[PDB]
């Protein structure tokens, strides 16, 4: 019941007690493990909301060494009253900041959580319109980008009320490149965003129909029809991709944006649901070069890079894909570092995460971790997380998946 | 009840009903996933339901369910268990059992070959010399002068747990490892503990870097005995690189035949504690794990030095670079010597084909994503984007504790 995890590279063994505080459900049973399913998983009644708040306020007041104190009981009863009356409640700013930091701390699929307590929380709960959302999101981007010295940030828009007044950022990330299907066959730009790039045009966007066109923001306030806004290009920091050894690399004409900013997730704190909460940090190199460039359903430039390297692409056993994959990821890290844009390689981030596990087992009793997502998508076994046993479980506050709004919005 | 898995690269969706026939437990619960945990004397009381389930399976597969042959076989085993507290498998049952243990091995990426298993019945064996003879013939047959063939040799099943047959080697062919007084290791660090046992048992250790270990074989619960595999039976491949002429000078070689010998074969509640099985290598087993794991031969540094890489900062990806070169060399060397080997791209593609076929004709294929995905270049292989369900089916290969930890020494 006090589970142990072993690192098989170092024989270090940590004891996990945090999992016994786990609330939600993983998707697995004693007969079937679903740990490789991408997604297991419209208002809260007054009865379910009350214990969710108590649990959250219990852990908040414990974290500041005031469990069972004046302020604790008072806040407990004050929230209790507010729920009985209004059917919901409002977080104090301190609770909001704690809640968001701990949603990140609890994100079992996130390798970058060593930074969890340094989150800059932007309270956008007074926002009322998509123009206002646009303003908050522009200020978020500017602050997070910081001329390339990237800083972690979240911007939290008004919480769900009755599911009819939802704030939503329709983009999956604040900054993404357009993808257009060609009349002949293949896809121009980013194929992962073809449907979204379509809903934009299909909503009025004038697409430059280039390869790396930054998509417009499609912002939904208080449940109304979403509105298009173009992020000021001077706010979108991009990095041209060159290789430190191969001069022809620059000629491929590739670039990527510096700010990874996920905007389609739901932030749950003390039972309250924040359907619009774009958060951002900085990239791990493999997220751009392994996945964005080399996935078959993405930019798929592997074949091209290998032809330019004069590699034998006739049999898989030459490992030409593997060789080109490494070069591409050397270039991405070289480019970002040359332009002084924050980035981390997968060796550094996974080493950081092992230290973070060390810290969480020591000062907290464990750290929920999803091995399938923590291990980087290349060179997996030469990174220290590969040989690290991890326990995955769901702690709240948390970031959760939510349906794409166009499947849901009574347009 | 049906369960669905989705390939996020092809959008292919498969339906799993086979998990309903699942007996044992996974280690997971509704509130915790143990999917990355490495490791998560039987009485008549519980034996006959396990026999009956196996025989029902066996007779279904031969389209004789409910037949008089089926019913008589059930009665026969029933009477044999009542009277002897165990039972013997017919030859046909043993062969079916061993193939299905492999077919059910959720961590095995090579299962497309499962129906082509050569089963060697060694249940008439009685002494360690007899085990040496059977194992020698296994190695000769499986090796087949480099045209490798899958095989398994099955020694007598457990009776009271006090008369076990065991192969103390983790694999039939493995290289010795010697801890030096200065803390360094000569040979394979993975085998230091077993090398020491062998030396203590009387092995004259040549103390080189690539010494094939002796067999340490235990018949009928007696003390184990040492045997030297005839070196002409041990096929080996010098490692060279097709472009780098200095690679041969590293002095690396590896053996052709992966033959795992420390696992337990479970068939109808019978336990075959000595059942060495062999196939052929996926390149990464040698070139990623055996050579580049920090706790193994760990030749990344010298390969990187001789490539004259920037080893100062990890963000140069010098480790990823040297890992690919080593894996090219392993594949090149085996193919040049006409020793069967499969690269990870071909092996993973075949597994997807196998897995789809198994869903179509069997209702499922239990599969352990954490183990199926190769330890390098993960996301550019098709299994990375493949959702999988993990569950335990019997017949099965189980882990068992090393025998030196449990053996009662006769002396
Ligand atoms: C600061 C540097 C950060 C790095 C290097 C990083 C890295 C990653 C990576 C590599 C993944 C796997 C996803 C994929 O491979 O596509 C991930 C997942 C995730 N990240 Fe982080 N991240 C960072 C910051 C943050 C921040 C600031 C937040 C929120 C405040 C966050 C929340 C999440 C969540 C919620 C997930 C997974 C969603 C889930 O659990 O289902 N990350 N991160
Ligand atoms: C013939 C070509 C084969 C290939 C290429 C292959 C490949 C692999 C690999 C890469 C693993 C993961 C282990 C590791 O990474 O160290 C594995 C696991 C395993 N393989 Fe295979 N294998 C083959 C044949 C066989 C055969 C013939 C058997 C038994 C008759 C077998 C039974 C297993 C078992 C029991 C496991 C552990 C599975 C578990 O615990 O669920 N394999 N295999
Ligand atoms: C702040 C941040 C920085 C970073 N460097 N990386 C990040 C990656 C994700 C993330 C989480 C889930 C996810 O996908 C899961 C979806 C259910 C399928 C994706 C990929 N869109 C990205 C979220 C935040 C990230
Ligand atoms: C026939 C065969 C061929 C091959 N090409 N590869 C194989 C790899 C394994 C295997 C299974 C488990 C395992 O490790 C399990 C850990 C104790 C829990 C290892 C690591 N040596 C290898 C077993 C058989 C293999
Ligand atoms: C900690 C982790 O579960 C452990 O290192 C596993 C991960 N996946 C693996 N996958 C394969 N194929 N082989 C292994 O040895 C391992 N080791
Ligand atoms: C099927 C599989 O679970 C899916 O492709 C996952 C695997 N692991 C991953 N891991 C990370 N970090 N990011 C991903 O998108 C995925 N995709
Ligand atoms: Zn699980």
8 Å CB contact between A201 and A219: no
A176: number of Cβ within 10 Å: 22
Alpha carbon separation from B160 to A376, A402, B220 (Å, rounded)? 46, 55, 10
In this chain, the answer to whether the domains covering B124-149+164-235+399-403 and B236-258+281-346 adopt an identical fold is no
Beta strands in A225-383 (DSSP E): 227-229, 238-240, 255-257, 261-262, 266-269, 272-274, 279-280
The radius of gyration computed from the CA coordinates of chain A, to the nearest angstrom, equals 23
Of all ligands present, the nearest one to the C-alpha of A101 is 1
Chain breaks in chain B (C to N over 2.5 A) after: 40
* Token pair listed for A129: 């319109």
8 Å CB contact between A285 and A329: yes
Top-level class of domain B236-258+281-346: alpha beta
Q: Which residue is it, tokens 């002068």?
A: B145
The residues, ordered by sequence, that sit 6+ positions from B144 with a Cβ below 8 Å of its Cβ are none
3-state secondary structure chain B: CCEEEEECCCCCEEEECHHHHCCCCCCCCCCCECCCCCCCCCCHHHHHHHHHHHHHHHHHHCCCCCCHHHHHHHHHHHHHHHHHCCCCCCHHHHHHHHHHHHHCCCCCCCHHHCCCCEEEECCCCCCHHHHHHHHHHHHHHHHHHHCCCCEEEECCCCCCCCCCCEECCCECCCECEEECCCCCEEECHHHHHHHHHHHHCCCCCCCCCCCECCEEEECCCCCCEEECCCHHHCCEEECCCCCCCCHHHHCCEEECCCEECCCEEEECCEEECCCCEECCEEHHHHHHHHHHCCCCCCCHHHHHHHCCCCCCCHHHCHHHHHHHHHHHHHHHHHHHCCCCEECHHHHHHHHHHHHHHHHHHHCCCCCCHHHHCCCCCHHHCCCCCECCCECCCCCEEECCCCHHHCCCCCC
Q: Which residue is it, tokens 């959250």?
A: A56
Closest CA to B369 of B391, B354, B353: B391
Task: Find out whether B342 is annotated in a ligand binding site.
Answer: no
8 Å CB contact between B327 and B288: yes
Alpha carbon separation from A372 to A39, A337, B179 (Å, rounded)? 13, 28, 34
Q: Is B246 exposed, middle or buried (0-12, 13-18, 19+ CB in 10 A)?
A: exposed
**Could A28 and B28 be called an inter-chain contact, meaning their C-beta atoms sit closer than 8 Å?**
yes
> How far away is chain B from the Cα of A336, in angstroms, using its nearest Cα?
11
Chain breaks in chain A (C to N over 2.5 A) after: 41
* Token pair listed for A373: 């997502």
CA B116 to chain CA mean position, Å: 16
Q: Which 34-53 residues of chain B touch chain A by CB within 8 A?
A: 34-38
* Quoted resolution (Å): 1.9
Catalytic residue (choose from A113, A160, A168, A176): A113
Look at residue B257 and give its three-state secondary structure. coil
Fold classification of A126-151+166-237+401-405 is Nitric Oxide Synthase;Heme Domain; Chain A, domain 2 (3.90.440)
CA distance A106 to A59: 13
The neighbouring-strand residues paired with B259 are: B278
CA distance B186 to B44: 49
Assign residue B237 a region: left if phi > 0, alpha if psi is -120 to 50, beta otherwise?
beta
8 Å CB contact between B380 and B38: no
Q: Which residues line ligand 1 (CB under 6 A)?
A: A 104, 107-112, 115, 119, 152, 154, 279, 281-282, 284, 287, 344, 349, 373, 399
Size of interface A-B (CB pairs under 8 A): 209
Closest CA to B342 of A315, A311, A377: A315
Query: In a mutagenesis test of the B interface, which of A8, A296, A322 is the best target, namely the one with the most B β-carbons within 10 Å?
Result: A322
Contacts of A395 in chain B (CB under 8 A): none
Q: What's the CA-to-centroid distance between B345 and ligand 6, angstroms? A: 18
* Token pair listed for B92: 């046909």
Beta strands in B168-219 (DSSP E): 177-179, 185-187, 215-218
Neighbours of ion ligand 7 (CB under 5 A): A 28, 33, 35; B 28, 33, 35
A318 touching chain B per CB within 8 A = yes
Q: In what order do the strands lie in the sheet with A168-169?
A: A168-169, A217-220, A227-229
CA distance A242 to A255: 9
Closest CA to B88 of B139, B39, B157, B7: B157
Number of residues that make up chain A: 411
Please state which of the four CATH numbers 3.40.920.10, 3.40.50.300, 3.40.190.10, 3.90.440.10 is assigned to the domain occupying B124-149+164-235+399-403: 3.90.440.10
CA distance A66 to A58: 9
8 Å CB contact between A327 and A243: yes
- For the structural domain made of B16-123+150-160+264-278+348-372, what CATH number should be given? 3.90.340.10
CA distance B179 to B182: 8
Task: Find out whether A170 is annotated in a ligand binding site.
Answer: no
CA distance B255 to B210: 10
CA distance B186 to B171: 19
Please confirm whether the linkage preceding A397 is cis (ω < 30° from 0). Answer: yes
Domain boundaries, chain B: 16-123+150-160+264-278+348-372, 124-149+164-235+399-403, 236-258+281-346
The residues, ordered by sequence, that sit 6+ positions from B393 with a Cβ below 8 Å of its Cβ are B18, B21, B22, B23, B100, B104, B366
- Residue A287 a catalytic site member: yes
> How far away is chain B from the Cα of A19, in angstroms, using its nearest Cα?
7
Q: Is B95 exposed, middle or buried (0-12, 13-18, 19+ CB in 10 A)?
A: middle
CA distance B349 to B382: 6
Assign residue A334 a region: left if phi > 0, alpha if psi is -120 to 50, beta otherwise?
alpha
* Token pair listed for B30: 């509704």
Q: Which element (helix H / strand E) includes B271?
A: strand B270-272
Alpha carbon separation from B131 to B135, B141, B166, B204, B405 (Å, rounded)? 6, 15, 10, 21, 21
Contacts of A393 in chain B (CB under 8 A): 31-33
CA distance A295 to A276: 28
Q: How big, in percent rounded to 5, are the helix, strand and coil portions of chain A? A: 40, 15, 45
**Could B28 and A26 be called an inter-chain contact, meaning their C-beta atoms sit closer than 8 Å?**
yes
8 Å CB contact between A94 and A185: no
Task: Find out whether A28 is annotated in a ligand binding site.
Answer: no
Q: Which 254-283 residues of chain B touch chain A by CB within 8 A?
A: 283
Cα dihedral sign, A104-B379-B296-A390: positive
The neighbouring-strand residues paired with B238 are: B253
Which residues in A129-148 are b (16+ Cβ under 10 Å) and which e?
Answer: ebeebbebbbebbeebbeeb
* Token pair listed for B141: 């047959």
**Could A35 and B33 be called an inter-chain contact, meaning their C-beta atoms sit closer than 8 Å?**
yes
Q: Write out the DSSP string of B28-60.
A: --SS-B-TT-S-----HHHHHHHHHHHHHHHHH
**What's the CATH architecture for A16-125+152-162+266-280+350-374?**
Alpha-Beta Complex (3.90)
Task: Find out whether B165 is annotated in a ligand binding site.
Answer: no
A390 touching chain B per CB within 8 A = yes
CA distance A227 to A232: 16
CA distance B406 to B410: 13
CA A210 to chain CA mean position, Å: 26
Look at residue A157 and give its three-state secondary structure. coil
Rounded to whole angstroms, the maximal C-alpha distance in chain B is 73
8 Å CB contact between B339 and A327: no
Q: Which residue is it, tokens 């981030």?
A: A349
Q: Which residue is it, tokens 């004038």?
A: A206
Catalytic residue (choose from B93, B266, B285, B325): B285
Which residues in B380-405 are b (16+ Cβ under 10 Å) and which e?
Answer: bbbbbbbbbbbbbbbbbbeeeeebee
Q: Which element (helix H / strand E) includes B120?
A: strand B118-121
Question: Is A238-260+283-348 CATH 3.30.465.10?
Answer: no
Q: Is B13 exposed, middle or buried (0-12, 13-18, 19+ CB in 10 A)?
A: exposed
Residue nearest to ligand 3 atom 23, measured at CA? A262
Alpha carbon separation from B79 to B48, B84, B94, B155, B268 (Å, rounded)? 10, 8, 19, 24, 15
**Could A391 and B324 be called an inter-chain contact, meaning their C-beta atoms sit closer than 8 Å?**
no
A399: number of Cβ within 10 Å: 21
CA distance B234 to B136: 10
Q: Which residues line ligand 4 (CB under 6 A)?
A: B 38-39, 258, 260, 277-279, 281-282, 285, 399
Q: Which element (helix H / strand E) includes B73?
A: helix B68-84
**Could B320 and A378 be called an inter-chain contact, meaning their C-beta atoms sit closer than 8 Å?**
yes
CA atoms within 13 A on the CB side of A383: 30
CA distance A118 to B19: 44
Contacts of A380 in chain B (CB under 8 A): 373-376, 378
* Token pair listed for B219: 């018949």
8 Å CB contact between A276 and A291: no
The residues, ordered by sequence, that sit 6+ positions from A219 with a Cβ below 8 Å of its Cβ are A130, A133, A134, A137, A168, A169, A170, A226, A227, A229
Q: What's the CA-to-centroid distance between A344 and ligand 5, angstroms? A: 24
- Residue A277 a catalytic site member: no
CA A254 to chain CA mean position, Å: 23
Task: Please report the atom of ligand 2 found closest to the CA of residue B279.
Answer: 1
* Token pair listed for B258: 């992966």
State the pairing for strand pair B151-154/B118-121. Answer: parallel
| B49-52, Cβ contacts within 8 angstroms, sequence gap of 24 or more | B50/B268, B50/B269, B50/B394, B51/B77, B51/B78, B51/B81, B51/B87, B51/B268, B51/B269, B52/B77
8 Å CB contact between B150 and B111: no
Task: Find out whether A169 is annotated in a ligand binding site.
Answer: no
Measured between its terminal Cα atoms, the distance across chain A in Å is 49
Measured between its terminal Cα atoms, the distance across chain B in Å is 56
Contacts of B241 in chain A (CB under 8 A): none
8 Å CB contact between B229 and B236: no
- B33 → chain A, closest CA residue: A392
Alpha carbon separation from A39 to A34, B8, B141, B177 (Å, rounded)? 10, 11, 46, 44
B154: number of Cβ within 10 Å: 25
Q: What's the CA-to-centroid distance between A373 and ligand 1, angstroms? A: 10
Question: Experimental method used, please?
Answer: X-ray
Q: Which element (helix H / strand E) includes A400?
A: strand A398-400
């Amino acid at each position: 019941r006090f589970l142990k995890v072993k690192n098989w590279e170092t024989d270090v063994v940590l004891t996990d007690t945090l999992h016994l505080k786990s609330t939600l459900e993983t998707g697995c049973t004693e007969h079937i493990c679903m740990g490789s399913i991408m997604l297991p998983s419209d208002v809260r009644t007054k009865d379910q909301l009350f214990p969710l708040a108590k649990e959250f306020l219990d852990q908040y007041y414990s974290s500041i060494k005031r469990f069972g104190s004046k302020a604790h009981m008072d806040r407990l009863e004050e929230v209790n009253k507010e729920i009985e009356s209004t059917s919901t409640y409002q977080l104090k700013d301190t609770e909001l900041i704690y809640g968001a930091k701990h949603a990140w701390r609890n994100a079992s699929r996130c390798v970058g959580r060593i930074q969890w307590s340094k989150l800059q929380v932007f309270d956008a709960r007074d926002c009322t319109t998509a123009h206002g959302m646009f303003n908050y999101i522009c200020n978020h981007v500017k602050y997070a980008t910081n001329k390339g010295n990237l800083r972690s940030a979240i911007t939290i828009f008004p919480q769900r009320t009755d599911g009819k007044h939802d704030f939503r950022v329709w983009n999956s990330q604040l900054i993404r490149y357009a993808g257009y299907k060609q009349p002949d066959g293949s896809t121009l730009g980013d194929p992962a965003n073809v449907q979204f790039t379509e809903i934009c045009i299909q909503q009025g966007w004038k697409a430059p129909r280039g390869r790396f066109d930054v998509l417009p923001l499609l912002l939904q306030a208080n449940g109304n029809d979403p509105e298009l806004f173009q992020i000021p290009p001077e706010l979108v920091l991009e990095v041209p991709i060159r290789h430190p050894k191969f001069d022809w690399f620059k000629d491929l004409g590739l670039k990527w944006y510096g700010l990874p900013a996920v905007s389609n997730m739901l932030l749950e704190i003390g039972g309250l649901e924040f359907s619009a909460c774009p958060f951002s940090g900085w990239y791990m190199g493999t997220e751009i070069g392994v996945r964005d460039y080399c996935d078959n359903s993405r930019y798929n430039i592997l074949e091209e890079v290998a032809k330019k390297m004069d590699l034998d692409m006739r049999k898989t056993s030459s490992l030409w894909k593997d060789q080109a994959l490494v070069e591409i990821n050397i270039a991405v890290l070289y480019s970002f570092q040359s332009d002084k844009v924050t980035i981390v390689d997968h060796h550094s981030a996974t080493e950081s995460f092992i230290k973070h596990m060390e810290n969480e087992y020591r000062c907290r009793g464990g750290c929920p971790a999803d091995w399938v997502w923590i291990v980087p998508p290349m060179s997996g076994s030469i990174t220290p997380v590969f040989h690290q046993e991890m326990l995955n479980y769901r702690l709240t506050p948390s970031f959760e998946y939510q349906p794409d709004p166009w499947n849901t919005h009574v347009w």
